[PDB]
Write a protein that binds this ligand. Sequence first.
Ligand code: BOG
Ligand code: BOG
Ligand code: BOG
Ligand code: BOG
Lengths: 304, 304, 304, 304
Amino acid sequence: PLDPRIKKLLESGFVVPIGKASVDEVRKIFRQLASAAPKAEVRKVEDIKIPGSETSINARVYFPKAKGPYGVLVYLHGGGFVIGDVESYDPLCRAITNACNCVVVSVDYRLAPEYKFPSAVIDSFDATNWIYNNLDKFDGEMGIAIAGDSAGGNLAAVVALLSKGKLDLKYQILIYPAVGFDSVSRSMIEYSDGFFLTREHIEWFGSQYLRSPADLLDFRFSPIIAQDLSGLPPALIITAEYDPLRDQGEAYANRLLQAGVPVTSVRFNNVIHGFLSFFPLIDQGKDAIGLIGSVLRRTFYDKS
Amino acid sequence: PLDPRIKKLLESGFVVPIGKASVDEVRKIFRQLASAAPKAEVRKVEDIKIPGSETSINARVYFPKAKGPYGVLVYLHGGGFVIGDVESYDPLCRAITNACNCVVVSVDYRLAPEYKFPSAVIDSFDATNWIYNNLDKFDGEMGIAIAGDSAGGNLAAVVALLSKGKLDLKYQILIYPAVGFDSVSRSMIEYSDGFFLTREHIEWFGSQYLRSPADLLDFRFSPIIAQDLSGLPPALIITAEYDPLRDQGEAYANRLLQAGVPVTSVRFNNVIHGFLSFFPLIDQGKDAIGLIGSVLRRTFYDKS
Amino acid sequence: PLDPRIKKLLESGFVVPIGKASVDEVRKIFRQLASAAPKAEVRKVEDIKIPGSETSINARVYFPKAKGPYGVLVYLHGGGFVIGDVESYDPLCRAITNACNCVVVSVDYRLAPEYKFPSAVIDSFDATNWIYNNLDKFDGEMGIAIAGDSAGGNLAAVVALLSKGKLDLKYQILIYPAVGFDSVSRSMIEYSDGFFLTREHIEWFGSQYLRSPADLLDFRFSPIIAQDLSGLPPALIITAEYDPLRDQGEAYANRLLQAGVPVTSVRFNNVIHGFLSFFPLIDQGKDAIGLIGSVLRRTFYDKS
Amino acid sequence: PLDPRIKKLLESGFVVPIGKASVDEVRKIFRQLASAAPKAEVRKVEDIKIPGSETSINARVYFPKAKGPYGVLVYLHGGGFVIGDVESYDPLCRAITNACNCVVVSVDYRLAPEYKFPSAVIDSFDATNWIYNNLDKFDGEMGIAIAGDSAGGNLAAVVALLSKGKLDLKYQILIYPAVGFDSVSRSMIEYSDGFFLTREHIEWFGSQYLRSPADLLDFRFSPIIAQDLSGLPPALIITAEYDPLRDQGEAYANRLLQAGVPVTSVRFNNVIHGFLSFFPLIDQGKDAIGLIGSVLRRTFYDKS
Ligand SMILES: CCCCCCCCO[C@@H]1O[C@H](CO)[C@@H](O)[C@H](O)[C@H]1O
Ligand SMILES: CCCCCCCCO[C@@H]1O[C@H](CO)[C@@H](O)[C@H](O)[C@H]1O
Ligand SMILES: CCCCCCCCO[C@@H]1O[C@H](CO)[C@@H](O)[C@H](O)[C@H]1O
Ligand SMILES: CCCCCCCCO[C@@H]1O[C@H](CO)[C@@H](O)[C@H](O)[C@H]1O
């Protein structure tokens, strides 16, 4: 069952009214929910503009208190390709920065419905490419990794595919990712309602982001159907027991493993989709952040 | 775990070498495996030709020993849209006839690769339509139901969708059906190899049957994504515990239930995909046939 | 998910208030719930007294309309060893009689708390032994089988063990059985509350029936830990997807299979514990009864 | 599926021949498998003797390079209550020490069959009590936590129960623990063979350790049936996807959560029982050690 703390929270009306309110209103509600978490101190924070192929991309850079050199984690926020932003994810990105002792660059990719697929992918890739080529600006010579949650985990997985034989990504962290279209998995059906992220929400996000059903078959939306997953960066894949997206994330882990990619796939039991965003309340979220910290300290620094 | 009888069978090389031999050779191997089962006596067997929209459709009609009037079960064989035929399914159709005390009409729909999607769907629908309009020829006034296994269960489900507000199908029986494209379910991943029907086979069948990836999004291949499942006939859906297709069949059951369609969804534990075809060996297959008999005797005759 | 029909029912307060009302009151509530189902006609019904080792055992005998000779199904009602009786199970036993075309003998074994374990086992065994030795009285020469639901499925499984090398039981039907003590299975934990049979109820029944914790290790309460399951009668084991007892019933199926006993293990999806008792409402219950009919017609008559 | 690395390992004969060789030989085989892992540097290692109630208890103390004050993790090795020792666990305890920046005290509790249950429990409790009362000897004033793997996770869970209202344990880490007797869970049945720890091994260990079947009902062997789990220390519970013990560990997590105890329950996918002992090969084991590090650094130091 759910952790009673989470059941209590859900029973008290913790919702984001996706598809039942205006885009502006759902963005506002999400901002207030996510941004309420404590902002842990880091050493320095900078807002930068990355020259993308299609737009000037805003990004926020978090520097850790630890001395350099650093690795750089490119972070892609979730929010169904429609909501969220760098500022609402500030508390989480600060927590990650402190866990990993690395530089985190959180990317404000273009959002749907204003900018449909593949805009978010293009921005995410362009940002990652620029950061790779400008690691010196962050004393970030230990290299680059990519991470994201939910829709941002989709983007991270896709960026890792697109980066093959261009960038040298050291690691990919996929936090309860969406990895394509799923009308069949048990978790999707079983947890379609009542667990914060619902099937109705998923469908609504899909309707805003994608241009046509053909986009469902594009590997830049459905990395699970990419032709060749071999040679991708080692992965940490975090899933949540009561998440409709659970099974598809675990499927992607399995597909990567079958392609010879190292993967640590961990299901956090008793919790829901989005649980890292609610780390102050949900203790397991702090522990997931600590696991991310471990894997990145190892990969970048060969430190415990 | 698998029933030890089935494990023994699999360990002895029970395969159909799908995608590793010629189409002719795999058809021949399947014919010999399936047609080896005993042919139980029925009252009468007739081969007929149904005038389809695109072809003359061969069908075999089995009459039960019980006196009429009958219901008529349209049966659509499995074989990945590529292999199988009415004659290889003769033992199974005779067993079904005797279980249900009804007329069974087994349809030789056009097969891939010679005839790609949607040829099998067109033939299956045209046959069902003709049988409905000619029930009097079989003393079949108690009505029409549709059934099929695996690829034939896909076709049956699709025919039921296409028949909405045209025919009056009384029942749909989906025996370990394929219901669309699945790259994510746990059963698909977990039982991808070693359980008779493999992922490699599934992919090969898909490559022979479908014309392009767009066909994956056609509801006539993926009934699970049909816009509206309401008003379809009551269903019996049989799945197998160790079948890659298990989860998607159970998902379709759930979607039908959510649309207000009565569904009895039963997972046969300890067995594999195709188990009804191997009823002489696999006892559970006889019991699945008996369950089909029960549901059809009830729906057609209001008899136990 | 649950069949919406069942969710609707549960949401409307369908409970038996086990452990929250007097024994008399919970017995009365259960009687009214179970006995409300239609009583289908059979050919003849007789109440008999079986001379048990410890008591005169009441039993009800149902004769089918079909002509003899018959097999005889000994039926052991559920109710947690505390509630239920032959009369509350009359509708279900009539339905079974008509499905199987056999004689059904429903046994009023002694109930807890008035008669603790192993009283119910002794009565169930003594009744089965007497019926075996008196099959001629029922024109029942096709033989004897045993069946029961829940606590009655526990008793049936135990009787089959005790009958080894004494009686010639042809078949055992275990309908969502309890097979011992379970504090660990996923189904027990996941469906501990909200699905009609709850963990609190299970614990309460255990407290009334068993004399001490040592009884938990007695194979006559926990057949799953019997030393040797080989040579037992072929089994049909029905489980329910949303039943705390699901996993343990499927475990027992697996243990029997491993001991070379034929088993057809079927999970009825979308339904709860007790669903056969509520066959008029829950359609899947009618289909489970039909499956029981199939297996018994085959075993007794070699008929479809 | 299993990580291909692990499948490869298993297919190459990675076994410990529990119950198929002498106790001496199985101890020797395990020692060579476990002790082959690299011994990472720590600051200092001391062997000590703890005055237990029934024996002088050997323990090894590992000090981290980080400066004090420290927390102290009491570590209880696995090995089915029969095999393993402090020395075979040296590589793992050094890895843990470095991950957590704390003192680790690995306890050589008495082993079966020479010393049956509850000897291991008594020694483990006595050691933990002594360490609590002697934290000053290790500059360990940040407090005490308890951890163990498999049989050692059983002991850790039991020590936490016994310590209620005596010691102030800050945390309990249960690494793929055994939590009692399980003849019913799906994982126990499904992964009974072929996944390193087998049911036959489990039964053999039980036969050596326990004195009689009554011991199965003793909460000091089956903490899952303890009367009251409330007030126990916060827990990290790690399970492995392909471990027969998986479901029972997840059940214990759920029971603790229901009793208001904080629990982070994480299933490591694609891996087997014992995977932390094989961290040099199995990368996921390094990441599990990092997760342990995170939770202990937080609890002891309020550090990331
Ligand atoms: C966390 C965000 C995951 C979003 C996954 C969306 C899955 C696809 O969503 C789908 O896409 C289509 C195209 O717009 C639509 O026709 C459908 O409404 C929808 O189901
Ligand atoms: C029992 C038969 C089920 C067949 C299910 C096939 C699922 C779709 O199969 C797919 O279709 C595509 C189009 O040809 C191909 O590109 C792929 O190889 C394949 O995975
Ligand atoms: C459908 C009926 C199943 C009943 C299963 C009971 C499982 C054992 O129940 C137990 O037995 C003990 C002895 O009385 C008690 O100490 C406990 O309260 C209880 O959990
Ligand atoms: C990782 C080690 C877990 C050991 C769990 C043992 C579970 C109980 O094991 C049992 O205990 C009994 C008493 O000795 C025996 O009668 C049985 O052989 C055995 O199944």
